[PDB]
Write a protein that binds this ligand. Structure first.
Ligand SMILES: CC(=O)N[C@@H]1[C@@H](O)[C@H](O)[C@@H](CO)O[C@H]1O
Ligand SMILES: CC(=O)N[C@@H]1[C@@H](O)[C@H](O)[C@@H](CO)O[C@H]1O
Ligand SMILES: CC(=O)N[C@@H]1[C@@H](O)[C@H](O)[C@@H](CO)O[C@H]1O
Ligand SMILES: CC(=O)N[C@@H]1[C@@H](O)[C@H](O)[C@@H](CO)O[C@H]1O
Ligand SMILES: [Ca+2]
Lengths: 396, 326
């Protein structure tokens, strides 16, 4: 029933608009019937204890584009139905631990464009119901804890864009995570060790993250991945059959990158040709050589099959000793996959348990067994063709 | 270049010494007249819900013309600065959301500073900045702005920094204002000060080099002269080529402020400019007549019409109209 003179209320009092009006303190006179409270573009700095105590039906609370520097402990007390909490473009130096405590309905929380210095351990743990979180545009960020995202087992969306981070933080407690945004950062090079534990992730955004190279078997852990955005990066080439373990993948964004078009970019060319339909996600163009510069991707030029440096030699060895099947390739780009006499195919990406394949392509054995004897074949694959090399192993 | 006529004392009598004139460069947006096509583009009737640039799931704020706090009329684009104008989200898919913002003047105006179009939500993936010297009859393109220049306009992506002193009048397509993950993520610029910098210099102290070229070359002088301006919007900020269909509320146009600074064309004959009957007109001096002082006043037709020149600095050549021969 009650309405403040500064704020513009609606009939039945569900939407309370306080936009454009200048306010230094939180306006007193908000009705209990209120479901939406908009306080965008204001001069409010401190959110006092029990400021939204009587508001039990309030779902969306907009406290964006304000001068909010400090939030008290009992500030968000009394809000049982609060789902969305807008806190973007403020003066917050640190995340208030005592603020986000008793919220069962909270699913969305935006905190972008704030001068937040450090994210501490067990942050957002008191609010596990959260499904969407945005911690973007943190220009004054200097520290990220190990257990920073701990407790957020139900979170699906996370935005760590423009935080100027060099390495991917601990995103392991985010099991249900589907969408991740790491765009506009200072990410040097994507290593295979990174992104592990994000099995349920489908969308990844790495737009203008200053990436220079993507190492072999980097996106192998992201099995359920559907879309990757790697636009506006300093990438020249990609490793052969990188998107092969990613079965559910369909859309890849590779535009605005200095691509060096040659024999090694043919697998990516055929991916756009057949795997991608009438609608293509990217409009990628070459930078080097200058004669091919600015042309759209998608075998006229001279190309050759992969060449093996050292073929696997037949060796006689006894049980217990360490065995090796040497198979080096001419270029580091080629993907090496061994075929055991059992029938199973072993690659470099797989875990190094007993029988393993390293970067050079050598098949290393820790302990030789009876069942291991037979005929071993190595298949070196390139974006143009395939070459095989036969070997016989003797177990005594 | 503020004074027109000064009391001069000669050996034989005492008359006036005529010099080059130039009015003060001020915020021109106060004198323009905005035109939008389609005119129903401004959201309000019926009220619509929009999404901010920050998150695609951030859909809580709405637009309503009936309430002044939620209304976004085109008047806010020229408001003293933040207030912003907004367009209706493209509900009609796959019909291209094309908006034309015609900035009419009905007077010749020579630009002095960069045309800055500060946006509120995203920078368009396809945009053309247009001009007119014939009061809106024909349209000449100033600069093109796109995400992929070779695909959108069939041109090679260039920049003002890549241009030269001999290629100032060249029309280029830039990718500088395409991405939204850098500083100035919501600002579109039309480099005029940088185009003057090829002659004047990086410091802009040696104005004599710029002034000298403007008096000799007519085409260079006409390049900065405008009677009308147009913001040809083609595709809104989508980022990725593959556009969403279920949530069309994410895509729309939003302009915070437009910075159009310059002087009215007086052909170096006037300093005073009166905005009489909703139109800016030159208060003609040096015995000149017309809207831009382009014609000699009858009875002052001794020598043919010639505009004033800046050289020498500061007292430039006026080239005033002399009386007719009996
Ligand atoms: C900013 C940046 O990454 N620059 C690199 C440059 O140092 C390197 O020599 C070149 C090699 O193609 O690729 C690019
Ligand atoms: C809404 C609308 O009228 N759009 C048209 C545009 O399609 C056309 O290309 C342009 C030509 O000047 O005039 C305007
Ligand atoms: C430059 C340009 O596109 N002009 C077109 C014109 O030819 C067309 O007849 C009109 C139809 O509304 O739209 C505009
Ligand atoms: C606008 C203008 O130039 N007016 C001058 C006038 O002041 C001057 O007395 C006269 C002398 O012939 O010439 C004319
Ligand atoms: Ca404004």
């Amino acid at each position: 029933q009650t309405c403040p003179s500064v704020c513009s209320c609606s009939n039945q009092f569900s939407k309370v608009i306080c936009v454009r009006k200048n306010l230094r303190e939180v306006p007193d006179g908000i009705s209990t019937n209120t479901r939406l409270l908009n306080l965008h573009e204001n001069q409010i700095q401190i959110i006092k204890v029990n400021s939204f105590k009587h508001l039990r039906h309030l779902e969306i609370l907009q406290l964006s584009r304000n001068h909010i520097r400090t939030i008290e402990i009992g500030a968000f007390n009394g809000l049982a139905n609060l789902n969305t909490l807008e806190l973007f473009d403020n003066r917050l130096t640190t995340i208030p631990n005592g603020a986000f405590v008793y919220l069962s309905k909270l699913k969305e929380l935006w905190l972008r464009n704030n001068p937040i210095e450090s994210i501490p351990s067990y942050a957002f743990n008191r609010i596990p119901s959260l499904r969407r979180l945005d911690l973007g545009e943190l220009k004054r960020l200097s520290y990220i804890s190990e257990g920073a995202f701990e407790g957020l087992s139900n979170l699906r969306y996370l935005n760590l864009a423009m935080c100027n981070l060099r390495e991917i933080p601990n995103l392991t407690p985010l099991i249900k995570l589907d969408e991740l945004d790491l765009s506009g950062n200072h990410l040097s090079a994507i290593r295979p060790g990174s992104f592990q534990g994000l099995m349920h992730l489908q969308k990844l955004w790495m737009i203008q993250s200053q990436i220079q190279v993507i190492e072999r078997n980097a996106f192998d852990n992201l099995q359920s991945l559907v879309e990757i955005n790697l636009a506006h990066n300093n990438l020249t080439l990609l490793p052969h059959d990188l998107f092969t373990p990613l079965h559910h993948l369909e859309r890849i964004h590779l535009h605005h990158n200095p691509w060096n078009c040659n024999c090694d970019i043919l697998w990516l060319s055929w991916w756009i040709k057949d795997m991608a339909p009438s609608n293509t996600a990217c409009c990628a163009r070459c930078n080097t050589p200058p004669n091919l510069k600015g042309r759209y991707i998608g075998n006229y030029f001279t190309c050759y099959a992969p060449v093996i440096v050292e073929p696997p030699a037949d060796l006689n060895v006894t049980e217990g000793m360490a065995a090796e099947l040497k198979c080096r390739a001419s270029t580091s780009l080629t993907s090496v996959s061994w075929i055991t006499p059992n029938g199973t195919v072993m690659t470099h990406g797989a875990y190094k348990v007993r029988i393993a394949v390293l970067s050079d392509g050598t098949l290393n054995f820790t302990n030789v067994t009876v069942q291991d004897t037979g005929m071993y074949t190595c298949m070196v694959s390139n974006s143009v063709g395939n070459t095989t090399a036969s070997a016989t192993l003797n177990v005594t | 270049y503020d004074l027109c006529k000064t009391q001069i004392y000669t050996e034989e009598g005492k008359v006036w010494d005529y010099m080059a004139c130039q009015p003060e460069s001020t915020d021109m947006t106060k004198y323009l007249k905005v035109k939008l096509d389609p005119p129903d583009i401004t959201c309000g009737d019926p009220p619509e819900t929009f999404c901010a640039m920050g998150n695609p799931y951030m859909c809580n704020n709405e637009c309503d013309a009936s309430t002044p706090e939620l209304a976004h009329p085109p008047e806010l684009m020229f408001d003293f600065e933040s207030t912003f104008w907004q367009s209706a989200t493209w509900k009609e898919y796959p019909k291209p959301l094309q908006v034309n913002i015609t900035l009419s003047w009905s007077k010749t105006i020579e630009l002095t500073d960069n045309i800055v179009i500060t946006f509120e939500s995203g920078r368009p993936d396809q945009m053309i900045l247009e001009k007119s010297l014939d009061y809106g009859r024909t349209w000449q393109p100033y600069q093109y702005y796109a995400t992929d220049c070779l695909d959108a306009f069939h041109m090679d992506p260039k920049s003002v920094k890549d241009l030269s002193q001999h290629t100032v009048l060249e029309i280029i397509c830039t990718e500088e204002y395409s991405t939204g993950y850098t500083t100035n993520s919501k600002i579109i610029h039309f480099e005029i000060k940088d185009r003057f910098a090829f002659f004047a210099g990086p410091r802009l102290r040696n104005m004599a080099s710029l002034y000298g070229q403007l008096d000799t070359t007519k085409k260079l002088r006409d390049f900065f002269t405008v009677t009308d301006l147009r913001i040809r919007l083609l595709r809104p900020a989508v980022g990725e080529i593959f556009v969403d269909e279920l949530h069309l509320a994410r895509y729309f146009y939003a302009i915070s402020d437009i910075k159009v600074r310059g002087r009215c064309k007086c052909n170096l004959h006037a300093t005073v400019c009166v905005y009489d009957n909703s139109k800016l007109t030159c208060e003609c001096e040096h015995n000149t007549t017309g809207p831009d002082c382009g014609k000699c006043k009858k009875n002052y037709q001794g020598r043919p019409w010639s505009p004033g020149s800046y050289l020498p600095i500061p007292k430039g050549a006026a080239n005033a109209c002399i009386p007719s021969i009996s």
